[PDB]
Amino acid sequence: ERPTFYRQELNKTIWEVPERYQNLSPVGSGAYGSVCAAFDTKTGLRVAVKKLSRPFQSIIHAKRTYRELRLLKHMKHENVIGLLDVFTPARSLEEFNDVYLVTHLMGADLNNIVKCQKLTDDHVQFLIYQILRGLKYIHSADIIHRDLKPSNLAVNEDCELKILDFGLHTDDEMTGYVATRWYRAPEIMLNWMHYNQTVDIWSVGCIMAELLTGRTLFPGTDHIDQLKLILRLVGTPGAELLKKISSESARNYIQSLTQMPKMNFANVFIGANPLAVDLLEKMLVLDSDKRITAAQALAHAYFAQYHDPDDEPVADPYDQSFESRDLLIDEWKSLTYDEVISFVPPP
Ligand SMILES: Cn1c(=O)c(Oc2ccccc2)cc2cnc(NC3CCOCC3)nc21
C-alpha cells in the first residue's frame, strides 16, 4: 500500500517523505533540485533525497523531469548512479505536483580526492578503469553524459566510483576561468558540429591527466584561451577535420590560426607510465571520429590488472523517442506520473 508520509520544513520548502526516511539533513545543490542526506530504515543505507523544484512549471521543465526520471530508472550498473526510490505524496494524477528521487549517499567527489596533489599510478588505473566501465554501459544505451568532470564523479571509502548527472549549463556558467568548461571537447565548446559519444572520452582524458599531474589540463580563462591551450598540445586541425566542421563560421576562425604540430606527450607527462601516456594520446585526439571508445579503452594494456571482458556489462535498449516528441505540460506530467507509479525497487 501507500506508506505514511510526514512533513518537515527543510531548505525553504516543506518536505513530505515516507516514514522510512529519517534524520533528513540539507546537503547541497543537485541537478534541478536540492538534496538531503537521510537514513533509510528499510535498507539500512544512507541515502541522498532530491526534491525537484517546480518540475512542471513549463514544457521545458516538464520534459526535463520526465527525462531525468527515465534516465535514472534505466541505469543499473555498479559504476553509474541508480535509483533506489522515487515517490510523490499525491494520491492521484490530479493532485500530483511533487517528485522526490532517492539514490545512494556518496562520501566525496573526485575534486576532494585530487586536492592539488598527484595520485599514484595504480590509483589512477583503478579510477579511470571504473569511469570507462560505467561509460561503456552508458554509451551502449546510446546515452551521452555530455558534462563529465571530477564533481560528477563520486567515490566511496574503498575508492569505488559512480558517475552522476548523465544525459541532461547556461552561457553564463560556461564563461571565464571555470571548471564547468575545462573538461569539454572542443567541438561542443565551440559548437563545431553535431557531436557524438566520444565527447565524453575527451573529458576522461582531461580527468586522467589531472589525476596524473594534480593540475588542470586545459585551465582556459575563456573559450578562446582554452582552445589555444588545447591546440598547442594536440596540434591544429588538418584538412580532413576541417571538412567535418559544418559551422562555416568556426571553420573560418580555425583557419586563421598559425599551424602547430602535436606535442610529444612523454615530454608533457614527465615520469608517467608509458602506457598511461599512450592511452592519453588515443583519448585526446582532436577529430572525434578517431578517438578511442570506452569499450576499446577497457582493452588497453594500461588496465591489464582490472580488465575482465566478462564483467563489463552493456545496457538494455533505451527508448528515447520521446526526445523528438512535442507534448503539452499535462501530457509530460501524466507520462511522469506513470513512471513514478510503475517504479520497482532494486534487490
Ligand atoms: C551531488 N549529488 C547529487 O546531485 C545527487 O543527485 C541525485 C540523483 C538522484 C537522486 C537523488 C539525488 C546525489 C548525490 C549523492 N551523494 C552525493 N555525495 C556528495 C557528498 C559530498 O561530497 C560530494 C559527493 N552527492 C550527490
mmCIF file with all atom_site columns, C-alpha atoms in Angstrom, residues 135 139 143-148 183-189 193-207 283-289 291-293:
data_model
loop_
_atom_site.group_PDB
_atom_site.id
_atom_site.type_symbol
_atom_site.label_atom_id
_atom_site.label_alt_id
_atom_site.label_comp_id
_atom_site.label_asym_id
_atom_site.label_entity_id
_atom_site.label_seq_id
_atom_site.pdbx_PDB_ins_code
_atom_site.Cartn_x
_atom_site.Cartn_y
_atom_site.Cartn_z
_atom_site.occupancy
_atom_site.B_iso_or_equiv
_atom_site.pdbx_formal_charge
_atom_site.auth_seq_id
_atom_site.auth_comp_id
_atom_site.auth_asym_id
_atom_site.auth_atom_id
_atom_site.pdbx_PDB_model_num
ATOM 1  C CA . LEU A 1 135 ? 30.762 4.853  -19.780 1.00 0.00 ? 135 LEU A CA 1
ATOM 2  C CA . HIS A 1 139 ? 27.153 4.588  -24.277 1.00 0.00 ? 139 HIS A CA 1
ATOM 3  C CA . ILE A 1 143 ? 23.195 7.844  -23.847 1.00 0.00 ? 143 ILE A CA 1
ATOM 4  C CA . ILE A 1 144 ? 25.808 10.609 -23.800 1.00 0.00 ? 144 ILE A CA 1
ATOM 5  C CA . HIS A 1 145 ? 26.794 12.173 -20.464 1.00 0.00 ? 145 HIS A CA 1
ATOM 6  C CA . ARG A 1 146 ? 27.887 15.451 -22.161 1.00 0.00 ? 146 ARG A CA 1
ATOM 7  C CA . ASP A 1 147 ? 29.290 17.021 -18.989 1.00 0.00 ? 147 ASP A CA 1
ATOM 8  C CA . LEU A 1 148 ? 31.787 14.668 -17.288 1.00 0.00 ? 148 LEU A CA 1
ATOM 9  C CA . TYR A 1 183 ? 36.663 19.234 -19.423 1.00 0.00 ? 183 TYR A CA 1
ATOM 10 C CA . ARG A 1 184 ? 34.561 19.906 -22.567 1.00 0.00 ? 184 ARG A CA 1
ATOM 11 C CA . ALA A 1 185 ? 35.532 18.625 -26.008 1.00 0.00 ? 185 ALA A CA 1
ATOM 12 C CA . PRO A 1 186 ? 36.415 21.500 -28.382 1.00 0.00 ? 186 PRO A CA 1
ATOM 13 C CA . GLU A 1 187 ? 33.671 20.559 -30.908 1.00 0.00 ? 187 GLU A CA 1
ATOM 14 C CA . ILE A 1 188 ? 30.989 21.030 -28.245 1.00 0.00 ? 188 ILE A CA 1
ATOM 15 C CA . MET A 1 189 ? 32.648 24.034 -26.510 1.00 0.00 ? 189 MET A CA 1
ATOM 16 C CA . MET A 1 193 ? 29.354 20.043 -35.417 1.00 0.00 ? 193 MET A CA 1
ATOM 17 C CA . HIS A 1 194 ? 26.667 17.571 -34.404 1.00 0.00 ? 194 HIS A CA 1
ATOM 18 C CA . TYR A 1 195 ? 28.614 15.683 -31.718 1.00 0.00 ? 195 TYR A CA 1
ATOM 19 C CA . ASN A 1 196 ? 28.726 12.035 -30.579 1.00 0.00 ? 196 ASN A CA 1
ATOM 20 C CA . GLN A 1 197 ? 29.603 9.860  -27.527 1.00 0.00 ? 197 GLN A CA 1
ATOM 21 C CA . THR A 1 198 ? 33.341 10.491 -27.843 1.00 0.00 ? 198 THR A CA 1
ATOM 22 C CA . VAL A 1 199 ? 32.838 13.969 -26.402 1.00 0.00 ? 199 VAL A CA 1
ATOM 23 C CA . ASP A 1 200 ? 32.874 12.033 -23.109 1.00 0.00 ? 200 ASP A CA 1
ATOM 24 C CA . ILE A 1 201 ? 36.167 10.279 -23.930 1.00 0.00 ? 201 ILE A CA 1
ATOM 25 C CA . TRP A 1 202 ? 37.782 13.733 -24.293 1.00 0.00 ? 202 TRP A CA 1
ATOM 26 C CA . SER A 1 203 ? 36.585 14.538 -20.739 1.00 0.00 ? 203 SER A CA 1
ATOM 27 C CA . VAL A 1 204 ? 38.024 11.295 -19.366 1.00 0.00 ? 204 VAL A CA 1
ATOM 28 C CA . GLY A 1 205 ? 41.332 12.314 -20.987 1.00 0.00 ? 205 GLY A CA 1
ATOM 29 C CA . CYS A 1 206 ? 41.282 15.674 -19.177 1.00 0.00 ? 206 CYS A CA 1
ATOM 30 C CA . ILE A 1 207 ? 40.407 13.972 -15.869 1.00 0.00 ? 207 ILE A CA 1
ATOM 31 C CA . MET A 1 283 ? 41.806 9.804  -25.934 1.00 0.00 ? 283 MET A CA 1
ATOM 32 C CA . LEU A 1 284 ? 42.905 13.373 -26.634 1.00 0.00 ? 284 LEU A CA 1
ATOM 33 C CA . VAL A 1 285 ? 42.515 13.318 -30.416 1.00 0.00 ? 285 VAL A CA 1
ATOM 34 C CA . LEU A 1 286 ? 41.028 16.433 -31.965 1.00 0.00 ? 286 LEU A CA 1
ATOM 35 C CA . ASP A 1 287 ? 38.990 14.575 -34.606 1.00 0.00 ? 287 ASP A CA 1
ATOM 36 C CA . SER A 1 288 ? 36.212 12.905 -32.662 1.00 0.00 ? 288 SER A CA 1
ATOM 37 C CA . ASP A 1 289 ? 35.806 10.160 -35.302 1.00 0.00 ? 289 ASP A CA 1
ATOM 38 C CA . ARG A 1 291 ? 39.044 8.898  -30.583 1.00 0.00 ? 291 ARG A CA 1
ATOM 39 C CA . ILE A 1 292 ? 39.274 5.630  -28.697 1.00 0.00 ? 292 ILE A CA 1
ATOM 40 C CA . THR A 1 293 ? 35.852 4.368  -27.491 1.00 0.00 ? 293 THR A CA 1
#
